Design a protein around this ligand. Structure first.
Ligand SMILES: [Pb+2]
Ligand SMILES: [Pb+2]
Ligand SMILES: [Pb+2]
Ligand SMILES: [Pb+2]
Lengths: 338, 338, 338, 339
């Protein structure tokens, strides 16, 4: 038996009762979902920008970040639908700290019940300020505690091909983006969109902390996220291949480009050069780039498991580069529209 | 909101009470796990052969195939540890029938509670006759209904990179093998072994159908499964590359070779050609090929979702070649040792 | 804190899966409930006889008794609907052994999970042979494990006035009888019938071992059980007072007379004297004595927690007396009839 | 078959997370339980006074009652340990509104999840201000949502004889009092004290909303509550009868007298007459009357189901002036008993 311990877990209803969505928060989520929805459905020419830390490890810095990006959101609101990256669970290449929910105190105490309280509280506050949130849905149980406060979800490169994750995505209430695979493979994400578009029947855990059988309807609001592979995949020809690829699979030829991870070749400031290309293509009149993803924090760089506004997982651009980038992208959209 | 229905699910304890492991069943499981443990520890020289249908879709044909194989298990137990493939859940490239548990009646009725009863009864019978079983652990909730009757598990190509699956593997009581990824990537499986080797803390569902926090020990008994990519990866060249990679990563250099899927270029009869090559290597002295995987059924080929013992998912070799193969492999094992 | 321990409890569904009602078991229950319905609705002139041990403490002796009583049940079937007392939970005046479910091994080990398995098995066997069962519904959680195999329920003297019990009775699928209170009070039972006749909404535990809100419909098949008080209340005097009382309260004037407990002044053999009196009433034309209750076992008397077919709680008449009594009652029904 | 529907129920942990006991709330509960423990143990000779509405049906009127009673609690805290009656579940003689938790909105809507929220919030507020609470434990599942904020529990006349209730009482953290039975029977309550004094093993629902097997230790802090029967049973005559019966039973000879229900012949006003009799006894040296129970509200009487603000919708209560007066009488009488 390779189970050392079983410890009790507060059900989703405990967290949803202790921290109910406020009316303003319920409204943030609703609008961001239908805004992201029309960006996908043609209807609105703005760019979805999902940006924020690689991981949330500090609610204080999280909130300082939030107020600064909410400011920029209201400014750039006519060009950009800015959603903040509030990533609570992190996929490791082997082992490592898996995010705030799993180990809030960053010493290996795994106080997951606190992790969940802290996480839902923070997510409530940010959404209540009027700023929408985005998260990676990695774990299969935590979605119930958080999904109602999320306006967009990502399925990571390491899990796009997983049927379990494509099943989860077909019953989420928010739009979802599928990262291409670690090696560059586009085909797994394309399949994943088609798979998540269908109804599925599977086993999941209810708001009451009990397993049950779930039938989903399928999620039409899914799109690919170009995130690099063995080499970058943000460029025009790459984008072109993915567009004819997506049209051959029967799906809207529209992409979100992630400036980070393998697209910034692990070189975070390169995120701005990726930005320069994408902005040059947006400004060039490239309709299909529907959204982008960027990893920023208050201070650039990263640490390892302690500084204040700096990432403890992936390296991010800091706030002045963030502001700059966001301005570029908006100007590029402006140019694209007229 | 995108969930169309929630239906109740019998907890693991209902299935474990209606169908407890008999003393014979329990003994099969224990000895098979010990066996594969010595083989992986290197202090036994026999080959692990995980063979059987691609998917179980018919308990009658499955009980038949099991007694036919038990004959060969007993007949070859000094050169080979034969474990039957009792795969109840299947990973689709997009959509399709996901296995017997998910849809036992192969019309889309999703009678998962029956699915689970049928699945646990069949697994009990096969184990009680003295034949061990192997399954793919795809879903996160079904393990509790079945893992005590499983002597080896596989994590599939589409989920080896998934942290959720590596977490599951670190707390399973049986040895586990990690398929390399769909395109050929060896590195994800190597990472997966290292990942699954560590203790993890995560959320899972207990025998009582309730979520809880779980801590694992890490599973020492995990190995890679070479299953092909864009290119076959069974040859002696590939087996050296993979052994060396494992050495860099500080892992025992051992592999299980899967004769099927991308190694047999998806046409089943090529499994005999892979068999020839691998027997050649084993006989020639390759100490590292620790196990193999083959997809066989009573009748060969496959059919689309209906002929008694033919596969309804991947094409398999039929019985004559199966018997032949188990012997090519057994002779090849005698030859590797003196 | 005055809680020494919490230990896990198999959900109703574990017991209902391990021991499903067979088709015979199901038809016993259905037919007996329809029978007692027909008697309480006044369409059939037979007498309901609920007879059997005070408590079940030994499945062997219970099975022996069941065989003997089943025989008498088919012999006497034209005048009597004989239901066996299979009482698994017992109300103590202060402390004592609370029944087989609570402590199956009569040493204070409280192996309630075994208790429940033993109890449901035994109840299944008795019912499957074609003999109906009657139980006291004392505890609020155990009903889910047993009620589908019960053809009549009693609410005890010490709990008739309890709202919790009257709530339980309004949602039971079998007829229910309310004992008058310990002191003789008729009024509490009359109120209890009216209370249980109404819809109630309250909290209970589901087949899955989880609390939920329950709305019941109300149970029209409830009647009083005259069980004595500070003095006996079986005489025709008493039966007229109680019929009139029921008329005032707008209830059908019908009674079940219990020959035991305070009606037999706690010494068992007096049950035959009460039997004589009540047979004399029935024969003389008393249409209202709808049923009776008697405490019998194989061997007469009782012991203290060991002899075989002897009660370990209240003293009972033994099998010889039982056969005689049952013959007396049948003849009296035959006289009443003409 | 006879069940028309099943609806979901928030587990105890949802309520305990949304409304945790504050540090003040926790302190109130602790000291009140310790206090009643020492009265019941004979180390303090103050009188326990459990007083308040028959039923809580209005959190606004209930909070006001609580600030007034809290005021009186601090001025009389030298002779009386005053605990407020916060009764959320009510036993009906046949059918009727079963209390705030069961039907908070008093139209039969049965919004029990709201009922529980409302009930735990109110109980938290009252305790956090520093006023202890008392409830009847009628239902077997609701205890998990409320017992940590309760400083004393009662088991009603209609359930004292029920084993299920005596099992619950043996594992409650607060002292418990057992009403004698509707008809006057003392013996059922005496048995219930002895029964609740022993360890029990039974099935109950955990903080997580799941059934489990529970072993309790037995509750030493239980006492009888004289509440009348076919006749009143408050007189020193009756108190003498009941005192030797508890001794014959092996129990400390101590009683709580309830001035209401069958002791006040169901007309509320009579509670003052009972008060006079019992004060007379206490002053005269009757060391066995350990506590009392009274039903009061802001406004006297009761009313049938807009409502008249602080008035009972179940049993008739004395109103606030009579309450203040009564509490003063009792405190003076406690003074006459120690010399
Ligand atoms: Pb990252
Ligand atoms: Pb396959
Ligand atoms: Pb008895
Ligand atoms: Pb009252």
């Amino acid at each position: 038996l390779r189970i050392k311990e079983i410890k009790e877990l507060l059900p989703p209803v405990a967290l949803l009762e202790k921290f109910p969505a406020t009316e303003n928060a319920a409204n943030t989520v609703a609008h961001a979902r239908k805004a992201i929805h029309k960006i996908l459905k043609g209807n609105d020419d703005r760019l979805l920008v999902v940006i924020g830390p690689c991981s949330i490890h500090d609610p204080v810095a999280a909130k300082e970040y939030a107020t600064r990006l909410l400011a920029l959101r209201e400014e750039l609101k006519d060009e950009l639908e800015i959603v903040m990256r509030v990533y609570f669970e992190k996929p490791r290449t082997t082992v490592g700290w898996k995010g705030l929910i799993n180990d809030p105190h960053m010493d290996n105490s795994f106080q997951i019940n606190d992790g969940l309280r802290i996480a839902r509280k923070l997510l409530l506050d940010i959404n209540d300020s009027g700023l929408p949130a985005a998260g990676e849905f990695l774990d299969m149980i935590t979605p119930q505690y958080l999904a109602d406060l999320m306006s967009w979800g990502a399925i990571g490169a390491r899990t796009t091909e997983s049927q379990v994750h494509r099943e989860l995505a077909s019953g989420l209430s928010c739009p979802v983006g599928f990262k291409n695979g670690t090696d560059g493979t586009i085909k797994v994400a394309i399949d994943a969109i088609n798979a998540a578009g269908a109804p599925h029947c599977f086993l999941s855990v209810t708001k009451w902390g009990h397993s049950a059988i779930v039938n989903t309807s399928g999620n039409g609001d899914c799109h690919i996220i170009l995130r690099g592979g063995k080499e970058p995949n943000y460029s025009a020809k790459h984008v072109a291949e993915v567009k004819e690829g997506l049209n051959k699979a029967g799906l809207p030829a529209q992409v979100m480009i992630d400036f980070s991870h393998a697209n910034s070749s692990k070189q975070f400031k390169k995120q701005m050069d990726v930005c320069a290309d994408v902005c040059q293509q947006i400004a060039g009149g490239e309709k299909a780039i529907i959204g982008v993803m960027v990893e920023s924090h208050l201070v650039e760089g990263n640490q390892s498991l302690l500084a204040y506004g700096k990432s403890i997982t992936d390296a991010c651009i800091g706030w002045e580069d963030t502001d700059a980038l966001l301005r570029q992208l908006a100007n590029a959209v402006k140019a694209r529209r007229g």
